[PDB]
Subunit: 115 residues, 4 copies
């Protein structure tokens, strides 16, 4: 599994469950093409987005729908979504774990890249 | 000044100086119209992006060129840029400060919304 | 002002106002000697903690009473306090700004060290 | 396993391996008594610190030796250590995952608490 995303809720101290996200890949014409999508599990994780064969070199964007998450909890947040844009597999295949920590007016994101 | 951006460097413990960013406003056709841009000062701040009259409600995107910043320091970064996407809403006199804390493989962003 | 503290609230998107904190200096017997204290202002800042003459090299601890802050807002917090422990070192004229971003189950802290 | 700690390196985008930490519990005389200690594995995780029976109600402090970690990588960091102080099991047994994200001049910590 070369691309996993983990989302945490900093207000409740819990995984962020049922968080939708869409992954896009930059096409040769500079447009964002849809690549994969899903929602986080009870553990706040989203696995199985892609495979090593499909996950070629490129610029990828993960758009995490944080706004819908907060609204469902009764909170009007600042951000429309959290966005994570990165070049992947530029030096050969890697495994990427994208983590996001969510608050109503703030978010942090980090990446762990393993060979 | 209805919109200010402050950028900090978590590796050097300093303001992030000379960081370029562009601000976009979402158009009716769902495309990003360039709105304002600049580079952070020696204090890591960028002021004078817009005026109260021009800064109407809508969806705005601040795209911070973090990749060029880390490249200038000789440090290999993860992200292509840091993106802050938010809805501006008229609820009394509001001033927006977008703060961003930068590390090579991570970034955090917060909004301070005051009167 | 060789030492300033700025505290932000990631739930409300605002400075964290009226947050009490104590600063300690580590003594030879490895105990924490009270050094300075105060409460953050309406801008979430606390100035005037020490002077250049008094702020000698050593190990310092800033203990931020985040628990009382969240209790005042009716929000159940995780941490008893936020602690920032650091060595102050004389390498040219240096001013320290300790920034802290608060959520109920998370906090981040950064140091901005300038001349 | 009721207490686990996970540490990430935001400069390298990797687990923070071989990070020492000590856990203390506040005694009835208001002193910090040693409770458990260990170092993070190749995955940046520390498991097996305690058991449900031993991990009684109390105020606990996790002191993560971040300074030694950065110095071994050739970096002189700001903080002496990262400190996480919290009341545990106040409403009955819980499982606590403490996460820390490390940069030379900044750290963030969060907690996931599960029943
Ligand atoms: C050193 C400094 N820091 C400022 N503000 C902030 N510092 C840090 C911020 C912040 O949130 N950090 C952060 C953290 C800690 C964790 C995760 C993510 C993040 Cl992003 S916000 C403002 C400031 N000023 C000087 C005085 N000017 C007078 C104008 O009248 C005002 C502006 N100087
Ligand atoms: C690299 C990695 N990180 C994991 N957990 C966390 N990553 C980051 C965490 C976190 O909170 N970051 C953070 C952020 C984002 C901001 C501020 C502050 C912080 Cl601290 S917590 C889990 C994990 N797994 C690999 C796949 N395994 C099998 C599938 O279940 C087990 C899970 N891999």
């Amino acid at each position: 599994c070369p691309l996993m995303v983990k989302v945490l809720d900093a207000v409740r101290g819990s995984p962020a469950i049922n968080v939708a996200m869409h992954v896009f890949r930059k096409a040769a014409d500079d447009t964002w093409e849809p690549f994969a999508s899903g929602k986080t599990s009870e553990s706040g994780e989203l696995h199985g987005l892609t495979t090593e064969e499909e996950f070629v070199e490129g610029i990828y964007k993960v758009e995490i729908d944080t706004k819908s998450y907060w609204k469902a909890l009764g909170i009007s947040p600042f951000h429309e979504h959290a966005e994570v844009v990165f070049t992947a597999n530029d030096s050969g295949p890697r495994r990427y774990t994208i983590a996001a920590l969510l608050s109503p007016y703030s978010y942090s994101t980090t990446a762990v890249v393993t060979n």
